[PDB]
Amino acid sequence: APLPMEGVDISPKQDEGVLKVIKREGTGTEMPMIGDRVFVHYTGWLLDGTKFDSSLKFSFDLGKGEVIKAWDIAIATMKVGEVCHITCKPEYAYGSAGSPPKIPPNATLVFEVELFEFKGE
Amino acid sequence: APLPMEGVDISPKQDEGVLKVIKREGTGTEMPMIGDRVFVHYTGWLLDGTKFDSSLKFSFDLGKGEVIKAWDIAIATMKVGEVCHITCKPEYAYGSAGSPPKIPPNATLVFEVELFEFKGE
Numbered sequence A, B: 001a002p003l004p005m006e007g008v009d010i011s012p013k014q015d016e017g018v019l020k021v022i023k024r025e026g027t028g029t030e031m032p033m034i035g036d037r038v039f040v041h042y043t044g045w046l047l048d049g050t051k052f053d054s055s056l057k058f059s060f061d062l063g064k065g066e067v068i069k070a071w072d073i074a075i076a077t078m079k080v081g082e083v084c085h086i087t088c089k090p091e092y093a094y095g096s097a098g099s100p101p102k103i104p105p106n107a108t109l110v111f112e113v114e115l116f117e118f119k120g121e
Helices: A069-075 B069-075
Strands: A018-024 A037-046 A051-054 A058-061 A083-088 A109-119 B018-024 B037-046 B051-054 B058-061 B083-088 B109-119
Touching: A018 A069, A069 A083, A069 A109, B018 B069, B069 B083, B069 B109
Parallel strands: none
Antiparallel strands: A018 A083, A037 A051, A037 A058, A037 A109, A083 A109, B018 B083, B037 B051, B037 B058, B037 B109, B083 B109
């Protein structure tokens, strides 16, 4: 959703570990910095379409290693109000331990994240 | 606005806060991941040529906010053996406060970084 959009690889290593497709552009200008408390709503899918979780705010500290790796990397690239879809390889998410019983080991996952707000360190 | 020689904006906000120039291509086949422990050698200079600090190994876990933001951002993109030059905006560095007496308020900093290795974790 929607086809003209191609997953841009945002993994800092550029190993295609995190492909982002902006679903809805933010109309704002502000963006999160490492250390900020961010507020988002999300939904998580297994590649086969199984919805494993959903804030439907969820909040956390950006760039502290507090959330999934794919998350620390993606949210640092969203405008407030932006909705995006990120495709996460196992190692940027749950790895080989998975999350019983909802997420198997070595699961490539897909997240729809909407950035609502953030507040400075 | 940086001249081509200051390097490429690798700041996830694409706001030019972290301009990286690759001075020696890494030969390794692995790159660090968030949470891994990295060992580096660095030297930092204020824009005016002033050397304020130099590790001539420095060690920390990547992506946890244990070092200046520009370092979690830059190092996440390096190969082992790679030597780079980061150019960072106060806000990806020491901001308004600075670090008296050597680093003034709102100082744009330049670092030479060499990644020697990193541990799995």
